Amino acid sequence: VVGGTEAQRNSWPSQISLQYRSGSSWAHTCGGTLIRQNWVMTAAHCVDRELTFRVVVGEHNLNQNDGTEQYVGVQKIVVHPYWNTDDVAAGYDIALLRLAQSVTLNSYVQLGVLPRAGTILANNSPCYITGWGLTRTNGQLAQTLQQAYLPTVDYAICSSSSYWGSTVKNSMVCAGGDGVRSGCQGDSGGPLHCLVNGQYAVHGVTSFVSRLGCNVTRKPTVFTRVSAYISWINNVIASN
Numbered sequence: 158v159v160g161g162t163e164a165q166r167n168s169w170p171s172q173i174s175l176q177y178r179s180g181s182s183w184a185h186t187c188g189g190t191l192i193r194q195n196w197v198m199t200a201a202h203c204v205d206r207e208l209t210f211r212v213v214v215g216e217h218n219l220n221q222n223d224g225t226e227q228y229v230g231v232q233k234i235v236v237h238p239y240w241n242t243d244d245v246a247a248g249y250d251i252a253l254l255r256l257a258q259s260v261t262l263n264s265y266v267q268l269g270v271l272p273r274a275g276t277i278l279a280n281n282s283p284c285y286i287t288g289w290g291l292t293r294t295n296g297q298l299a300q301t302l303q304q305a306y307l308p309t310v311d312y313a314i315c316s317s318s319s320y321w322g323s324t325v326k327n328s329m330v331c332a333g334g335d336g337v338r339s340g341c342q343g344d345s346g347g348p349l350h351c352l353v354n355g356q357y358a359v360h361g362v363t364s365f366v367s368r369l370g371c372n373v374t375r376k377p378t379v380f381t382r383v384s385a386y387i388s389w390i391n392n393v394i395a396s397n
């Protein structure tokens with residue numbers, strides 16, 4: 158997250174860190190959202206490599222013991238059947254991970270609230286991005302979870318030529334684009350939390366930023382629109 162503020166320890170309890178095994182150690186690569194005690198939602202692109210993955214729930218500082226973490230293996234990866242690694246702009250950047258065991262819920266580990274199917278946010282709706290991703294273009298990961306206020310940009314504006322043009326699809330949410338605040342590498346797969354009827358719900362899965370940099374004026378961060386995939390998510394969980 159570029160231009161964020163440090164998140165409080167108990168603000169975003171559905172956020173997870175998706176990590177891969179790197180020799181003798183584990184490295185954060187993506188975010189995700191805990192959606193059941195044994196299922197995580199993340200970006201398909203985060204799991205294209207055939208690595209060993211684990212999920213950490215209850216994480217705040219990647220590099221220190223917080224006394225709240227639970228570490229769990231990934232038992233099954235279900236990528237959207239239409240995902241194409243070579244065409245991120247086509248969409249379908251969503252995957253579900255079945256965890257090897259159920260996590261324990263507490264004030265640091267809670268399920269994310271999903272929107273109703275088909276829900277579209279008005280322009281300039283209040284949302285926050287969270288993650289441990291780079292804090293500057295071509296910078297370094299955050300140690301502590303960051304948040305940034307990232308209001309939505311509706312499809313008509315986002316798909317206009319001075320924004321993203323035809324690269325964005327109606328199956329995506331755009332947020333931000335002020336040139337100061339954005340997602341960045343290592344935020345991928347994580348949530349966009351948006352306030353609807355008094356409750357934060359997870360409306361986006363972080364998918365991509367510009368090749369020119371993370372925080373680029375009129376190139377909002379782009380998310381998979383979770384409300385486009387409710388039927389798919391429910392079908393996967395019911396059959397696995």
Ligand SMILES: O=S([O-])[O-]
Pocket residue numbers: 186187202203341342343344345
């Ligand atoms: O997957 S990287 O683009 O955050």
Ligand SMILES: [Ca+2]
Pocket residue numbers: 216217218219220221222223224226
């Ligand atoms: Ca920690």
